[PDB]
Amino acid sequence: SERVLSYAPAFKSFLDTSFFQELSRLKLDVLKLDSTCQPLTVNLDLHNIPKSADQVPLFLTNRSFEKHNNKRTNEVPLQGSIFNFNVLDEFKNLDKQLFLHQRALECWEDGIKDINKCVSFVIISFADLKKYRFYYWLGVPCFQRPSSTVLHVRPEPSLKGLFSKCQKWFDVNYSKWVCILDADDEIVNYDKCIIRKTKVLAIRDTSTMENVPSALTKNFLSVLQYDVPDLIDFKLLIIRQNEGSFALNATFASIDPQSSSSNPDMKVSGWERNVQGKLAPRVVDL
């Protein structure tokens, strides 16, 4: 009955025509450069996920490039960036693992200051304005640090009562990805001194796959383990805005750990799969 936790892809991309139109404007602005990197923002809607989708879509438009106050109620802002190559060869030859790894390290550095900031996304692109074809690849850095850490889990029915409280807490606290129980069983913001004692953590989940949490869970668990290095057993609530929230009795375990007091490494995944289900770029024609 005790399983090694596995995960689902955190997001699926949809880049609207207007995104590529706006990218085109951007590229024409920096035609003489090898590349540019620009910030993006998307507002995630976790209440209106298609019944047939497996996770939250990332719906990108021209407005994603801008600092709009266009957020609707309960939407979760997510920050990322687009790295656009002006030469297709550079796009092709970019070492994708090293690149996503570096994005993960930034999430990590943000995460240890604030667990709620250890999530982001990146788009790498090449815009062929001659053929009006756009190549892009979404990456969502999901990391396990140290790379040796895994989680043993088994179902925990008893915590079903907390789900609606978390659902509402998350709706209101739109900038938060994590909450925990305090000593009075009330939901509060993550605080390492408190969870160390109460050992109940809830995560805002972006997947809809039955009983399989989003790979972003690894980011949060990594920060948790850094903050509370001797935490072993705890309860993990996976909170969704549909009926599919679930709870796990969790235990940190390790495979092939590094010697204590070495610089812990990290394992990183999160490149989006394409139309054929391969780890490869997507292509769009305008």
């Binding site: 092709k92 994708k96 693992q97 690849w137 490149w271 391969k278 780890l279 490869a280 292509v283």
Partner: peptide
Amino acid sequence: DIDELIQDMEIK
């Protein structure tokens, strides 16, 4: 050569 490019960029 779209199909060729995508194949060359596939990772593991």
